Design a protein around this ligand. Structure first.
Ligand code: BCB
Ligand code: BCB
Ligand code: BCB
Ligand SMILES: C/C=C1/c2cc3[nH]c4c(c3C)C(=O)[C@H](C(=O)OC)c4c3nc(cc4[nH]c(cc(n2)[C@@H]1C)c(C(C)=O)c4C)[C@@H](C)[C@@H]3CCC(=O)OC/C=C(\C)CCC[C@H](C)CCC[C@@H](C)CCCC(C)C
Ligand SMILES: C/C=C1/c2cc3[nH]c4c(c3C)C(=O)[C@H](C(=O)OC)c4c3nc(cc4[nH]c(cc(n2)[C@@H]1C)c(C(C)=O)c4C)[C@@H](C)[C@@H]3CCC(=O)OC/C=C(\C)CCC[C@H](C)CCC[C@H](C)CCCC(C)C
Ligand SMILES: CC(C)=CCC/C(C)=C/CC/C(C)=C/CC/C(C)=C/CC/C(C)=C/CC/C(C)=C/CC/C(C)=C/CC1=C(C)C(=O)c2ccccc2C1=O
Ligand code: HEM
Ligand code: HEM
Ligand code: HEM
Ligand code: HEM
Ligand SMILES: CC(C)=CCC/C(C)=C/C=C/C(C)=C/C=C/C(C)=C/C=C\C=C(C)\C=C\C=C(/C)CC/C=C(\C)CCCC(C)C
Ligand SMILES: CCCCCCCCCCCC[N+](C)(C)[O-]
Ligand SMILES: CCCCCCCCCCCC[N+](C)(C)[O-]
Ligand SMILES: CCNc1nc(Cl)nc(NC(C)C)n1
Ligand SMILES: [Fe+2]
Lengths: 258, 332, 273, 323
């Protein structure tokens, strides 16, 4: 007789093969694939002239709402209906839903395409003890550049067009993670500052190089409301602005690479 | 530590199973050259004469040979085993029937064994056969022999280091690693498998599910048996200068038919053959040998796959002298 | 059909090639020139897989197998049913994969994000080539590559391993396995941590960046930090193949013995022999 | 290009932070010290570290495990130092070579192996506790402790439980570098080729999947580092352009997409299942399946191939073969 044998043609391992697969497709389809739907659902679309249904599929695919209780007060519940109210200066290039949109203004300023930002909270990211998290080193006093690294304060910022566009006045540090995230510059020919996220900067000994945008385009870099603080949504505005240059700083960048 | 392209590859299994030999051309060449030293057959003599059984006195095995034939044999024997020493290695200088020296009687028994191998172990040695040269390679002590404990260097013509000496215990694990192609397998497949017929090489089940009655507790073969068998195969592979897929399709090591090559069945026979030589010819020779010869348990030196093969899938790349020396068998 | 936030990103631009021509979406799929070639090859390769498979003795999915040619055809073209198909399917596979890779660049370009993903995706394509193209070229025949079969490809891995007596002792393999195991563990840790912070249990407050650092400083005395654990994961993962490629390439073209014996370079330093 | 994703161009130094535990803040020993080259591709601070009971316990047990293995290993080269250092890899501490069933083997034949097996278990145990607590103490979920449990359970399976189930200690995993490796072939051989174990397959599927996922996730984040994608907690409670762009990348490529939280769920799950699938396969092996190739053959899955060299009958079954 055999260990595991169940019938004329059944055995344990073989049944457990079946159960194994079931556990997997269960967790994957009924759990994880629904967890994936806590942002951006329900899918937005055109509209119908007459429609009346709590369209069933849109209910079935969603998980039950979850709520995070936020560390410094408040709650957030996901999923939730979060339509994009803001007007988008874009226009359909052809007819079909597949068709790409095109900017009708300055996409850098309009913030469409790679220049877009999320409607993040207009609040200031905090450290764990309540302080503003991302702040210039003027404010962040117990913070310092590590011995060995270029201190960009003083250095010129140089744009994609090769032209000096400003001068670095400060570095903003993350005090939760001890990590610089922006440089601040006095814009040349303006009395504004710009922050530029450190990822858009090539840090040389003698200059800071920024390829995303031409010197001209630093003028319309987004403006903070406070000057020693920055909100989550501003971080998004600032970052998206340079990202947009990567497609839009000059006319040929949107076109076929090769 | 590396070897340069190209490699010589063969195919031993259906395309896409990655089965075959992987040979470094230079190594093959160097073994080809060492094996090339097989002395050619002595010129054939016409058999004018009586049986040396009539002519000579103390001739037991080759008694039926004419005189000229017989001395031809004695010349080949001398050239294969004790060339540097000459006839006298075995004979009394002044009396040739004299069994005074142990090489005589040992050599006598080895003519018998040699004729056994060629007559009865045909399913292994086929029509290639062995001669004295196959093991001895021109010295009285064969270069590759096995004691009831691992020893190093494998070629006994090399000088042992301290650590290699069987007495240096700190060197045990290495003596063993070097007999199983450098694995750490803590078994000696020679004494477990090849010295005698006590152990079973197959360790893999032939049913999908565990049979009730042999599958629990002390009913079971310990996992160590699988390690052992692996060790043996590591050894065989290295002995033949080949890899598992010379014999197995690794899909199912336990299966024969399409899952095994002709060379696996030949190897199966060689295990049987080796056990016979060891148990019935070679082990008994501790009676007839000087202490000088014997190992730490008074065991005579014995044979494994290397003793003949010495690193090649066919000994001496398949050279034969079988039609040249019929004395040595097959004996009708 | 569009995610709630998707529409503002759906702008023209970013193509490597083609420009406006295939710059559009079918459903959620960006197409682009390489979407078009990816699909062409897939359909090719999958058609060949069908005809090949149909010429053979089985339609059990585990047992279907399309194999390379006998060693004897060398690096030459082999008859359709005798390795020819396998040859064609391989070309289609490579075309599919690289299309998929370049299509990822175009998507990255349009979204204004780094090209790190298609780059990471080059590692497995590379390893695919080591196994099927490079190592067969070094060894002289397409007959050394692996068969396209769910189970048969394991029989090839098996035998290839045992050609070198014990593949486990292959130093390239040892490095590979270690990366495979570290990365599996680290993905577990990085996932478990981010989840533990965002989902503390009961109604307790979502925690912070400072907690993540604190947890691992506490447990092991070091925290690699948030950006750096992603850079690590991409490194540990990628190195499974980048270091493994050497173990694979070495076997046959640079080492013909068992892999245990390779270590004799250490064991046999005569100083301690 | 984004050099930040390659390394930290300008490092920042600042006062060392401490997030307070709900206990044991007083067991964090050591002075934070900073490495400049570490800081280039990681956080620069090394240390402090938390002591604790579970931790000390873990250390105590593991150190004993190790002393037993090393002492026996040392016995193997008969206490010669140089041969010890030379032969280290080959050296091991083995389970019963003989069939003692579930009987306690003598020290010379597996007795010591059991010992070390015990202390390693308690070592792993105490460490689990520490991994679970620190999370609790810091007000965190225990997802890590749970993922670790599965890993520990796997070890239990191959070290203890499978030998108990079949009723032989001889089946366990030796301690030692090459020896633990040789076991892998010993085990697969006896159980008829682990390639044909379905759960070996699932496990590899998840292991490769971890490679796929951690390459994909790591790269995705570095690729949106410019939009602060690394700050994953706050991209969770407040979706930003980073994880919008991460999602649309994946939606446009493969057609569906995770979120920034859920992708860590997919990640955790895949990691977990490597260990889960593997334990199941070990639990079934020997208990209910003796030969996986033949089990597969039994159930129709196994591939089959033409003879290439002539088919070779088992000699042993011929007419008047020896034994
Ligand atoms: C007996 C034989 C053995 C063996 C033989 C072996 C060989 C022969 C090789 C490895 C290799 C490897 N082994 Mg080893 N192995 C490993 C682990 C590993 C891997 C880390 C490594 C790389 C695998 C690979 O190349 O993937 C390759 C995966 C690829 C190329 C995937 C390409 C994906 C492609 C880009 C896209 C495909 C898309 C789909 C077609 C489309 C999708 C369709 C649907 C989904 C839409 C472990 C953990 C163990 C254990 C625990 O024992 C082990 C045991 C053994 N291995 C045995 C000892 N191993 C390889 C190596 O690197 O060695 C150094 C290698 O060559
Ligand atoms: C050097 C060693 C190799 C190796 C060793 C290996 C082992 C030892 C094992 C697998 C296993 C598997 N392998 Mg193989 N493998 C596979 C694909 C596969 C799957 C059939 C399966 C699960 C893998 C997985 O989940 O990955 C992670 C990816 C995930 C989770 C995403 C989903 C991918 C999806 C499962 C892909 C399925 C592929 C389709 C069958 C292909 C069909 C293509 C066309 C016709 C549509 C591909 C597509 C390739 C290519 C293109 O190179 C490849 C190369 C190799 N594998 C190397 C040759 N593979 C396991 C198995 O169970 O085999 C039966 C297993 O045991
Ligand atoms: C010839 C032998 C083969 C073999 C034999 C084999 C066996 C016998 C087993 C596997 C198993 C597994 N194999 Mg397979 N294998 C694998 C991959 C894998 C893994 C996915 C999985 C093992 C799980 C694991 O990660 O362990 C690594 C992770 C571990 C060990 C967990 C550690 C956790 C622990 C808490 C850490 C503790 C450390 C502390 C410091 C301890 C302190 C120590 C001190 C105190 C002494 C690949 C990718 C390949 C390929 C490509 O060929 C392959 C080929 C083969 N395997 C051959 C067919 N494999 C396992 C399985 O899944 O089977 C069902 C299994 O048991
Ligand atoms: C070290 C880093 C690793 C790594 C990394 C990354 N991995 C990526 C990315 C990154 C970064 C992506 O960006 C890209 C992706 O989109 O993510 C979802 C991708 C992808 N990884 C897949 C499979 C996968 N990754 C494996 C391994 C690793 N990934 C390692 C671990 C394995 C292993 C381990 O076996 C598998 C099987 C696909 C799902 C997907 C390609 C889809 C495609 O290419 O579409 C194009 C092709 C198809 C849809 C089908 C084409 C069919 C051909 C024409 C006909 C069949 C060919 C034949 C060869 C079949 C043989 C079958 C037989 C052996 C049984
Ligand atoms: C799929 C998911 C998997 C996965 C998952 C996870 N893995 C985890 C976690 C998760 C989630 C944790 O949370 C936990 C952890 O904490 O991480 C930070 C952990 C861990 N995974 C380790 C090793 C690992 N994971 C492997 C595999 C997988 N992991 C698989 C792949 C492998 C493989 C591949 O073999 C390895 C080797 C350890 C680093 C760690 C446990 C340490 C321990 O258990 O402590 C046990 C304690 C000891 C041995 C103490 C003794 C040590 C000293 C130095 C001895 C000194 C001797 C001296 C003689 C005396 C001097 C005295 C002095 C006073 C003079
Ligand atoms: C229909 C048609 C003919 C169209 C023309 C257009 C065209 C070219 C269509 C392509 C059609 C084809 C060929 C589709 C096949 C798609 C493929 C290759 C699917 C495989 C998907 C698989 C198996 C993935 C395996 C990995 C996996 C388990 C993923 C699930 C989790 C996900 C979705 C991860 C990806 C992902 C990662 C890695 C992040 O880190 C991340 C971070 C923050 C937010 C989101 C993400 C995110 O989604
Ligand atoms: C060297 C060329 C050599 C000579 C010469 C030689 C001669 C020889 C004769 C003539 C006999 C018969 C003696 C008698 O009357 O019994 C004989 C017998 C045996 N020999 Fe011899 N022999 C020479 C060399 C060697 C060598 C090198 C050995 C040992 C390896 C050896 C052995 C023997 C044996 C045994 C016999 C008996 C044969 C038998 O049929 O029983 N000889 N030899
Ligand atoms: C062929 C007919 C043949 C002869 C002749 C022969 C002789 C022989 C002698 C002289 C000895 C004793 C050596 C010593 O001085 O102690 C001896 C020993 C061994 N032999 Fe031999 N041998 C002949 C054939 C074969 C063959 C075919 C093999 C291998 C299968 C073989 C092997 C051995 C072995 C082993 C020994 C024992 C160790 C030793 O005493 O040297 N011989 N042989
Ligand atoms: C290569 C290192 C190698 C491996 C691995 C291997 C394994 C192996 C196993 C697991 C068995 C047992 C089969 C069972 O349990 O039924 C086994 C048996 C035999 N082998 Fe083997 N083998 C390896 C290599 C080689 C080589 C190079 C050959 C042929 C020259 C060979 C031969 C054999 C034979 C014969 C058997 C049967 C044992 C008997 O019946 O006594 N193997 N092998
Ligand atoms: C030890 C158990 C051993 C093994 C293993 C073994 C294997 C083996 C094989 C696979 C062949 C055939 C190779 C092929 O067909 O390509 C083969 C052939 C011969 N062997 Fe052998 N052999 C083992 C042991 C021994 C010993 C101890 C000797 C010498 C007394 C010996 C001899 C031979 C001979 C001779 C052949 C050649 C057959 C041929 O066709 O040329 N083997 N062996
Ligand atoms: C007592 C009875 C009746 C029952 C007990 C049951 C029990 C719980 C038994 C358990 C057995 C177990 C769990 C066995 C598991 C075995 C396993 C998985 C072992 C695996 C591999 C081991 C390997 C690779 C390692 C071995 C050891 C070494 C390499 C030496 C270690 C050395 C060091 C870590 C260096 C220390 C010094 C360094 C810090 C500088
Ligand atoms: C073989 C190992 C386990 C593989 C598990 C595969 C998970 C793939 C999930 C993708 C499912 C996608 N979708 C849209 C159908 O939900
Ligand atoms: C990695 C090994 C996978 C082995 C799969 C074994 C499946 C057993 C269950 C029956 C499956 C039937 N089928 C499709 C093969 O005919
Ligand atoms: C901020 C995330 N930090 C972090 N994350 C992980 Cl997954 N590991 C570590 N450190 C050790 C376990 C390598 N630190
Ligand atoms: Fe992450």
């Amino acid at each position: 007789m055999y260990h595991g044998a169940l019938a004329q043609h059944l055995d344990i391992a073989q049944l457990v093969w079946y159960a194994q697969w079931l556990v997997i497709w269960t967790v994957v389809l009924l759990y994880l694939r629904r967890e994936d739907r806590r942002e951006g659902y329900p899918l937005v679309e055109p509209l119908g002239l007459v429609k009346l249904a709590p369209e069933d599929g849109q209910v079935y695919e969603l998980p039950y709402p979850k709520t995070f209780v936020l560390p410094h007060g408040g709650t957030v519940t996901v999923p939730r209906r979060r339509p994009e109210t803001r007007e988008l200066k874009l226009a359909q290039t052809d007819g079909f839903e597949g068709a790409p949109l095109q900017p009708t203004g300055n996409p850098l300023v309009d913030a469409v395409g790679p220049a877009s930002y999320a409607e993040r909270a207009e609040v200031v990211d905090a450290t764990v003890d309540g302080k503003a998290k991302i702040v210039p080193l003027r404010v962040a006093t117990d913070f310092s550049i590590a011995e060995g690294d270029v201190d960009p304060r003083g250095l010129p910022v140089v744009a994609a067009d090769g032209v000096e566009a400003g001068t670095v006045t400060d570095l903003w540090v993350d005090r939760s993670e001890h990590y610089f995230r922006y440089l601040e510059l006095s814009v040349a020919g303006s009395a504004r500052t710009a922050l530029i996220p450190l990822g858009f900067c090539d840090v040389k000994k003698d200059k800071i190089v920024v390829t995303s945008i031409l010197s001209e385009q630093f003028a319309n870099v987004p403006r903070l409301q406070s000057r020693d603080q920055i909100t989550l949504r501003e971080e998004d505005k600032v970052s998206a602005y340079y990202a947009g240059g990567l497609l839009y700083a000059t006319p040929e960048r949107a076109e076929s690479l090769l | 530590c590396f070897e340069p392209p190209p490699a010589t590859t063969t195919q031993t299994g259906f395309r896409g199973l990655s089965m075959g030999e992987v040979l470094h051309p230079a190594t093959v060449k160097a073994k080809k050259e060492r094996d090339a030293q097989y002395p050619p057959a002595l010129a054939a003599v016409k058999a004018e004469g009586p049986p040396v059984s009539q002519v000579y006195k103390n001739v037991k095995v080759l008694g039926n040979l004419t005189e000229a034939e017989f001395l031809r044999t004695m010349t080949a024997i001398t050239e294969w085993v004790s060339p540097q020493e000459g006839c006298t290695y075995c004979h009394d200088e002044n009396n040739l029937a004299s069994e005074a020296k142990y090489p005589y009687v040992v050599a006598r028994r080895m003519l018998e064994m040699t004729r056994a191998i060629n007559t009865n172990w045909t399913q292994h040695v086929a029509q290639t056969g062995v001669t004295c040269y196959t093991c001895h390679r021109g010295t009285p002590l064969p270069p590759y022999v096995r004691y009831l404990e691992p020893t190093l260097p494998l070629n006994n013509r090399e000088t042992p280091t301290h650590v290699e000496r069987v007495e240096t215990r700190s060197g045990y694990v290495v003596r063993l690693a070097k007999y199983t192609a450098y694995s750490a397998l803590n078994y000696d497949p020679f004494t477990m498998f090849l010295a005698n017929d006590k152990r079973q090489v197959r360790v893999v089940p032939q049913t999908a599910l565990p049979l009730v009655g042999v599958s629990r507790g002390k009913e079971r073969r310990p996992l160590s048996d699988a390690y052992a068998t692996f060790a043996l195969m590591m050894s065989i592979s290295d002995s033949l200068g080949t890899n598992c897929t010379f014999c197995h399709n690794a899909q199912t090591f336990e299966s024969w038919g399409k899952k095994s090559t002709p060379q696996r069945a030949i190897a199966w026979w060689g295990i049987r053959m080796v056990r016979d030589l060891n148990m019935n010819y070679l082990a008994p020779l501790n009676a007839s040998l000087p202490a000088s010869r014997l190992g730490r348990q008074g065991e005579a030196p014995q044979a494994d796959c290397r003793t003949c093969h010495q690193g090649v899938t066919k000994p001496l790349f398949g050279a034969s002298r079988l039609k040249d020396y019929p004395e040595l068998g097959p004996i009708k | 059909a569009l995610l709630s936030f998707e529409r503002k990103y759906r702008v023209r631009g970013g193509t490597l090639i083609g420009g406006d021509l295939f710059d559009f979406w079918v459903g959620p799929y960006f197409v682009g020139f390489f979407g078009v070639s990816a699909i062409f090859f897939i359909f090719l390769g999958v058609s060949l897989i069908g005809y090949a498979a149909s010429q053979g003795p089985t339609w059990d999915p585990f047992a279907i197998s399309i194999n390379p040619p006998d060693l004897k055809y060398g690096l030459g073209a082999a008859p359709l049913l005798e390795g020819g198909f396998w040859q064609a399917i391989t070309v289609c596979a490579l075309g599919a994969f690289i299309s998929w890779m370049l299509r990822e660049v175009e998507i990255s370009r349009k979204l204004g994000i780094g090209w790190h993903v298609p780059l990471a995706f080059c590692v497995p394509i590379f390893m695919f080539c080591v196994l099927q193209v490079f190592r067969p070229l070094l060894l002289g025949s397409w007959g050394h590559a692996f068969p396209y079969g769910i189970l048969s490809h394991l029989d090839w891995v098996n035998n290839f391993g045992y050609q070198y007596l014990n593949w486990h002792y292959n130093p390239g393999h040892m490095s590979s396995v270690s990366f495979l195991f570290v990365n599996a563990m680290a993905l577990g840790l990085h996932g478990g941590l981010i989840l533990s912070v965002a989902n503390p249990g009961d109604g307790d407050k979502v925690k912070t960046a400072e907690h993540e650092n604190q947890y691992f400083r506490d447990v092991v005395g070091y925290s690699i930090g948030a950006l750096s654990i992603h850079r690590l994961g991409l490194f540990l993962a990628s190195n499974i193949f980048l270091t493994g490629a050497f173990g694979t390439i070495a076997s046959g073209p640079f080492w013909t013995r068992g892999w245990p014996e390779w270590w004799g370079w250490w064991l046999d330093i005569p100083f301690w022999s | 290009a984004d050099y930040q994703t390659i390394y930290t161009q300008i490092q920042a130094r600042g006062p060392h932070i401490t997030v307070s535990g709900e206990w044991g803040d007083n067991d964090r020993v050591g002075k934070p010290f900073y490495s400049y080259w570490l800081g280039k591709i990681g956080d620069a601070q090394i240390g402090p570290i938390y002591l604790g009971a579970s931790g000390i316990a873990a250390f105590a047990f593991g150190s004993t495990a190790i002393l037993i293995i090393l002492f026996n290993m040392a016995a193997e080269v008969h206490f010669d130092p140089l041969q010890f250092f030379r032969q280290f890899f080959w050296l091991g501490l083995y389970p019963p070579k003989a069939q003692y069933g579930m009987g306690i083997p003598p020290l010379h034949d597996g007795g010591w192996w059991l010992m070390a097996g015990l202390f390693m278990t308690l070592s792993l145990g105490s460490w689990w506790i520490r991994v679970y607590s620190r999370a609790r103490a810091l007000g965190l979920g225990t997802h890590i402790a749970w993922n670790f449990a599965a890993a520990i359970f796997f070890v239990l399976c191959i070290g203890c439980i499978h030998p108990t189930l079949v009723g032989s200690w001889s089946e366990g995993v030796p301690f030692g570098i090459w020896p633990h490796i040789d076991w892998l072939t010993a085990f697969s051989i006896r159980y008829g080729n682990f390639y044909y174990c379905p759960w070996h397959g699932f496990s590899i599927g998840f292991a490769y999947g971890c490679g796929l996922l951690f390459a994909a996730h790591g790269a995705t984040i570095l690729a949106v580092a410019r939009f602060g994608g690394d700050r994953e907690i706050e991209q969770i409670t407040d979706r930003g352009t980073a994880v919008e762009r991460a999602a649309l990348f994946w939606r446009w490529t493969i057609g569906f997409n995770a979120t920034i939280e859920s992708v860590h769920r997919w990640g955790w799950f895949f990691s977990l299942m490597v260990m889960v699938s593997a334990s199941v396969g070990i639990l079934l092996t020997g208990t209910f399946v003796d030969n996986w190739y033949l089990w597969c053959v039994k159930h129709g899955a196994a591939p089959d191939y033409p003879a290439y060299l002539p088919a070779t009958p088992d000699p042993a079954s011929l007419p008047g073969a020896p034994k």
